Amino acid sequence: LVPRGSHMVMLAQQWRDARPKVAGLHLDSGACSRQSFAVIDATTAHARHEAEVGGYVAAEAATPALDAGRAAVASLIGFAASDVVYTSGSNHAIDLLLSSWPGKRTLACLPGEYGPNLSAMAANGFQVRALPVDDDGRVLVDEASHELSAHPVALVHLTALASHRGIAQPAAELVEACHNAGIPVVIDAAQALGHLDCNVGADAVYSSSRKWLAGPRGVGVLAVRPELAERLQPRIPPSDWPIPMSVLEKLELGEHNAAARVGFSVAVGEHLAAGPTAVRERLAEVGRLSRQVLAEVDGWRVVEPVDQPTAITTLESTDGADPASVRSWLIAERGIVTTACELARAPFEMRTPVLRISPHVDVTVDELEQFAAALREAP
Amino acid sequence: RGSHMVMLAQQWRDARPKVAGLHLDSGACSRQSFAVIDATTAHARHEAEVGGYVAAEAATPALDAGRAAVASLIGFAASDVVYTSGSNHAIDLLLSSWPGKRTLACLPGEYGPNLSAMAANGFQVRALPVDDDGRVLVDEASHELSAHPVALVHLTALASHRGIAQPAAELVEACHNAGIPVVIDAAQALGHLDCNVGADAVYSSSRKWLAGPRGVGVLAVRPELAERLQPRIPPSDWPIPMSVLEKLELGEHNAAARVGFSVAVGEHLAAGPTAVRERLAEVGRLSRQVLAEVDGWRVVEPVDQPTAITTLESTDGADPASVRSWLIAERGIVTTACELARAPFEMRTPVLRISPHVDVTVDELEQFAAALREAP
Numbered sequence: 225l226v227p228r229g230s231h232m233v234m235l236a237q238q239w240r241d242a243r244p245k246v247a248g249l250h251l252d253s254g255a256c257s258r259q260s261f262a263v264i265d266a267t268t269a270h271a272r273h274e275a276e277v278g279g280y281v282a283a284e285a286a287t288p289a290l291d292a293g294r295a296a297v298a299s300l301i302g303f304a305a306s307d308v309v310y311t312s313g314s315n316h317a318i319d320l321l322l323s324s325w326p327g328k329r330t331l332a333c334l335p336g337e338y339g340p341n342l343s344a345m346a347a348n349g350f351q352v353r354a355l356p357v358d359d360d361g362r363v364l365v366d367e368a369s370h371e372l373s374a375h376p377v378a379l380v381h382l383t384a385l386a387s388h389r390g391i392a393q394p395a396a397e398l399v400e401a402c403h404n405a406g407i408p409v410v411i412d413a414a415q416a417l418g419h420l421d422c423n424v425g426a427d428a429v430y431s432s433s434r435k436w437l438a439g440p441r442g443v444g445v446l447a448v449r450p451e452l453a454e455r456l457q458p459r460i461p462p463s464d465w466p467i468p469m470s471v472l473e474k475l476e477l478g479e480h481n482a483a484a485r486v487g488f489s490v491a492v493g494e495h496l497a498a499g500p501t502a503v504r505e506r507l508a509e510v511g512r513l514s515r516q517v518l519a520e521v522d523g524w525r526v527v528e529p530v531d532q533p534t535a536i537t538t539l540e541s542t543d544g545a546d547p548a549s550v551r552s553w554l555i556a557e558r559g560i561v562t563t564a565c566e567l568a569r570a571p572f573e574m575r576t577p578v579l580r581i582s583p584h585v586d587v588t589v590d591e592l593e594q595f596a597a598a599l600r601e602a603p
Numbered sequence: 604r605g606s607h608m609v610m611l612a613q614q615w616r617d618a619r620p621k622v623a624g625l626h627l628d629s630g631a632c633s634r635q636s637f638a639v640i641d642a643t644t645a646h647a648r649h650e651a652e653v654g655g656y657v658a659a660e661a662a663t664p665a666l667d668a669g670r671a672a673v674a675s676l677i678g679f680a681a682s683d684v685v686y687t688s689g690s691n692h693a694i695d696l697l698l699s700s701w702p703g704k705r706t707l708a709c710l711p712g713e714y715g716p717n718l719s720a721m722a723a724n725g726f727q728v729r730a731l732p733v734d735d736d737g738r739v740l741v742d743e744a745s746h747e748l749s750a751h752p753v754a755l756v757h758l759t760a761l762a763s764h765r766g767i768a769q770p771a772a773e774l775v776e777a778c779h780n781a782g783i784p785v786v787i788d789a790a791q792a793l794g795h796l797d798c799n800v801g802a803d804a805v806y807s808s809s810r811k812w813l814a815g816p817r818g819v820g821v822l823a824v825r826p827e828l829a830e831r832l833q834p835r836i837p838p839s840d841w842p843i844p845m846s847v848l849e850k851l852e853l854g855e856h857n858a859a860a861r862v863g864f865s866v867a868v869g870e871h872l873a874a875g876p877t878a879v880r881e882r883l884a885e886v887g888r889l890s891r892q893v894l895a896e897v898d899g900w901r902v903v904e905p906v907d908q909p910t911a912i913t914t915l916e917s918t919d920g921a922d923p924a925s926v927r928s929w930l931i932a933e934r935g936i937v938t939t940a941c942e943l944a945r946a947p948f949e950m951r952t953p954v955l956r957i958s959p960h961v962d963v964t965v966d967e968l969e970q971f972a973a974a975l976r977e978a979p
């Protein structure tokens with residue numbers, strides 16, 4: 225570890241300038257990022273259009289934008305546009321899928337599985353087994369391969385990037401291992417979409433608008449391969465359904481904020497326009513710089529290996545400080561936005577809570593140093 | 604009577620974007636005021652400045668004011684009120700949480716997707732007695748519920764497919780006398796009918812008569828009932844300590860739209876609920892008078908129904924859906940076409956629905972009547 229300087233990318237500056245000026249310092253795009261002026265305007269415009277021509281007329285007329293959003297998402301995950309459906313977010317997504325699941329309801333997932341995912345799993349009558357992982361919580365693909373062949377399961381649920389830790393999971397290799405054992409794979413890409421390469425052959429993928437794609441809140445996407453989709457049995461309407469519609473049409477049924485969905489379509493568009501690979505390489509870099517700058521802070525140790533290709537960095541207190549209090553202090557006294565991850569976020573992995581930073585492409589080394597500095601003089 | 608001059612109507616029109624053509628469809632989706640649109644935009648901007656959840660925390664006063672306004676309209680407490688994605692979200696949250704024996708009675712004109720949610724949640728559904736208009740007969744219902752009791756009564760106080768105002772208050776006390784709680788679907792009724800009627804739970808949608816943003820609804824449950832409920836998510840066997848209402852309000856949502864909504868209900872209170880409702884009743888009367896004499900269409904609602912919903916049944920087998928498309932494409936007039944699926948146990952034939960808000964004029968109603976005559 226001989227420190228390395230930051231790459232200069234105009235991407236960072238373009239991205240900062242495309243969105244409102246931050247009041248203080250925002251290191252929290254893993255919780256909720258920042259909508260561009262274009263995304264905010266497109267949302268506002270739809271709401272105005274609803275008033276001028278009627279809400280549903282407006283919605284019909286927005287079909288091109290909506291479909292473009294499906295198509296953009298589809299391209300990032302290697303699906304077809306018509307496999308992609310809108311939701312309220314990722315927890316909505318997993319519930320739609322698991323509540324629709326036919327036959328034996330068993331699955332395997334990581335021990336670091338997201339608390340509310342486990343909640344949805346249990347609530348849908350699933351039996352849940354842990355996959356083998358190393359000390360960082362990263363799946364051991366070979367071991368998992370053998371385990372799944374001997375002791376199969378109805379599906380594997382992989383959270384490719386966890387909310388509580390910035391480890392990038394070997395999604396692609398695990399997918400082919402599961403497919404070799406004849407088991408479909410669902411991916412929670414709430415953190416991963418717009419961040420990791422999510423084109424990995426999965427059978428279903430879901431994600432949230434408001435995180436790395438910097439879309440409006442209250443939107444998510446769920447993508448399901450046609451072979452799987454047609455096997456599914458939605459909860460509403462009941463399977464003796466007089467109205468004839470496809471599974472995906474049923475899963476997309478319901479009042480929603482249409483303006484926010486067109487907002488989202490603009491946001492994914494901005495990601496494609498910026499260059500997915502370039503954005504991801506930059507986020508990997510942000511993580512490296514973060515872990516380098518924060519390597520030497522009294523009372524905090526960096527959890528992630530330095531070279532993890534993610535922008536999520538988590539800090540564990542070494543003298544029993546409470547992340548939640550530090551976050552409140554950082555906001556109130558320094559205007560620095562972070563997230564405090566409680567144990568409930570990953571109850572079968574986390575033994576102690578952590579402070580999480582999740583900066584986007586626009587963060588500077590100076591800003592990371594300001595955070596480090598503020599973290600030292602915290603009471 | 605007829606051409607009442609009401610300043611409310613003009614203020615309401617001018618507080619919102621100019622309509623392109625003619626909008627008679629506030630029962631499907633109304634029109635957000637500039638203030639509501641701006642408040643929504645502002646929250647989204649604030650999320651970008653200070654962080655999404657920081658912004659959400661800071662918006663608590665507005666959000667709580669929205670709960671309090673809703674509470675005042677239904678005669679509940681603010682802390683009984685929870686936000687949802689809409690009314691179908693609401694009914695599902697409630698029915699999926701319902702403890703013990705799952706039986707209910709509802710109207711035959713019950714909303715199709717309500718029946719869907721009922722069936723999906725394992726409820727047995729019995730019809731309430733009604734007159735020829737689909738309006739509940741409270742005395743008969745009283746006897747029926749005493750003889751054959753049920754876990755709850757679900758009343759849609761104003762239907763999507765017909766502008767009959769149900770005697771909610773009378774039915775509520777009849778059910779309470781039989782010891783049976785009452786849930787009210789006030790998607791159409793809130794901001795429209797007096798919804799302060801002693802119900803045990805009430806829900807509604809933002810985008811209709813209150814002219815709020817889409818993707819927001821409210822669900823209100825009395826504390827005695829709320830604490831008996833057993834939410835689906837998280838599972839009841841789970842460790843996380845939160846109230847029932849906290850559980851039902853759990854989830855990613857558009858926070859900006861909720862503050863938008865709080866502004867919208869505020870505008871309703873500010874305008875005077877009673878005055879707005881009296882004006883909507885008037886709009887219905889005028890609509891049915893103007894449309895009384897149209898070839899190929901009969902008016903379904905009695906003229907004096909205190910609602911702004913008027914429905915038209917074709918007398919020579921015209922298809923409402925096609926007429927709606929024509930009206931939009933060729934005349935710029937926005938209506939809704941109600942298919943049988945909207946009330947499958949009442950509707951024998953589909954209908955064209957108009958649902959104008961307070962701002963409609965007699966002239967505009969005549970233009971609609973005229974356009975309806977020269978429709979192919």
Ligand SMILES: *Cc1c(COP(=O)(O)O)cnc(C)c1O
Pocket residue numbers: 254312313314315316338383385386387412414415431432433444854855
């Ligand atoms: C954000 C998050 C979720 C939940 O997403 P919502 O949009 O809030 O439902 C699930 N998975 C992970 C990894 C998360 O970070």
Ligand SMILES: *Cc1c(COP(=O)(O)O)cnc(C)c1O
Pocket residue numbers: 478479630688689690691692714759761762763788790791807808809820
């Ligand atoms: C609009 C409507 C609903 C469903 O409302 P959503 O917000 O679309 O869920 C339910 N009841 C009636 C009377 C309706 O008209």
